[PDB]
């Protein structure tokens, strides 16, 4: 239970820094093409084209937290930049997990 | 004030320059002209 974190730590220390290069590439299409084509697309596919909507969903289903979130776009090398971002954020008292 | 349970970060950075919350004069609001955001924005900054 990710809530187990809220034994040892306050709601505001579980941070979330998951990023991507473009991410949401599928909704991104439904917006710029599937809709101009008049195919049946959701009304909110805009929601799901943002890099940080993934991140958000993680927080809305698992770890309900008032933690920092900084989602990066470092193209091919995103995943590492994310480690950096998360690293630094943790080394500034912003969060522990 | 890093991780100080007895010092809110707002206090912290303000106190480091010799100020309390009373010196926070202007609050710049997101305030998007939408229904919920403005009732909420005010709220958060208020409670704080």
């Amino acid at each position: 239970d990710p809530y187990e974190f809220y034994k040892y730590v306050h709601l505001s220390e579980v941070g979330n820094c998951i990023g991507s290069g473009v991410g949401g590439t599928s909704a991104l299409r439904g917006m710029y093409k599937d809709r101009y084509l008049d195919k049946p697309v959701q009304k909110d596919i805009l929601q799901e084209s943002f890099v940080n909507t993934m991140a958000a969903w993680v927080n809305m289903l698992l770890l309900s937290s008032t933690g920092p979130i900084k989602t990066p776009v470092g193209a091919c090398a995103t995943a590492v930049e994310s480690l950096d971002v998360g690293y630094d954020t943790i080394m500034q008292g912003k969060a522990r997990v | 004030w890093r991780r100080d349970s007895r010092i809110a970060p707002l206090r912290g950075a303000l106190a480091t320059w010799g100020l309390t919350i009373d010196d926070l004069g202007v609050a710049s609001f997101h305030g998007t002209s939408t229904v919920a955001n403005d009732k909420n924005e005010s709220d958060v900054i208020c409670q704080q």
């Binding site: 809220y6 034994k7 306050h10 | 409670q47």
Partner: peptide
Amino acid sequence: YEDRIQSKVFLNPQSRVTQESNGELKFPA
């Protein structure tokens, strides 16, 4: 946290979840 507590939990930098009477994790009233 139950909704009524939210503001308090958010502001008490030591408020932490306790084990509960089903096994669920909950901030106490």
